Every structure is written in structure tokens, then in C-alpha cells.
């Protein structure tokens, strides 16, 4: 109710609960979260860049073609990672609404 700006409007009631009667050894009670948030997209935004920073100069790469992979393999693997940046970006701020009925105006254009 508080963190409404942190949930996704087209997935109602965002929780899977489970509850075991049995605590840890010595603990009264405890909790364990799992969350799947678009907010982890930073990792993939940085590592595809920290890797790009290497491929732009082909730095260290000869240790890796040194085991018989191809110079293509690492671009394939960054490009697999770029599409997963689009994957987090496409559910960011997302809506689910009617088609050909509308096209968007905001409230002002000028900064």
C-alpha cells in the first residue's frame, strides 16, 4: 500500500507466501525474501559496458581464444546480454491497454 510505486499494475497481488512452523536452531522466528525487480538492470548495464570496454581494444582476449573459442563468441554473449537489458526495460513503467484507440500526449514538452 505504501510501496505502490514499486509494483506492477498488470500483475495483481504480487506475493507468493510460504510459512513453516519450524524456525532455525536458536531462532524464534525469521523471514526470507525473493524479489524479481527491473531495478537489478544496473548489473547488466554495467557488465555489458565493462566487457565492451574490453572488446573495443580486444584486451585480455587471447587468454580466451587460447582455449579454442571464436572471436565471435564474446560478441554473441554480450548481445545475449543487451537483449536482457531490453527485457528489463520493456516491463519498466509498462502498461497493458487498447490499440489504435489512442496515442500519447503528456502535460508539457518544454523543459
Amino acid at each position: 500500500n505504501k510501496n505502490s510505486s514499486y509494483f506492477v499494475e498488470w500483475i495483481p497481488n504480487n506475493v507468493k507466501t510460504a510459512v513453516c512452523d519450524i524456525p532455525p536452531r536458536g531462532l524464534k522466528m525469521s523471514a526470507t525474501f525473493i524479489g524479481n525487480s527491473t531495478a537489478i538492470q544496473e548489473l547488466f548495464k554495467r557488465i555489458s559496458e565493462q566487457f565492451t570496454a574490453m572488446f573495443r581494444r580486444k584486451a585480455f582476449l587471447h587468454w580466451y581464444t587460447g582455449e579454442g573459442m571464436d572471436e565471435m563468441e564474446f560478441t554473441e554473449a554480450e548481445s545475449n546480454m543487451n537483449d536482457l537489458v531490453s527485457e528489463y526495460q520493456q516491463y519498466q513503467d509498462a502498461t497493458a491497454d487498447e490499440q489504435g484507440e489512442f496515442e500519447e500526449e503528456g502535460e508539457e514538452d518544454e523543459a
Binding site: 565492451t52 572488446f55 573495443r56 581494444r57 580486444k58 584486451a59 543487451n82 537483449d83 537489458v85 531490453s86 526495460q89
Partner: peptide, 10 residues
């Protein structure tokens, strides 16, 4: 050092 530029798109 062997250095290629890349424009990229998504």
C-alpha cells in the same frame, strides 16, 4: 592495439 568501434542498437 587491435581496436574496433561498434555502434549498437536494441
Amino acid at each position: 592495439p587491435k581496436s574496433p568501434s561498434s555502434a549498437k542498437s536494441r
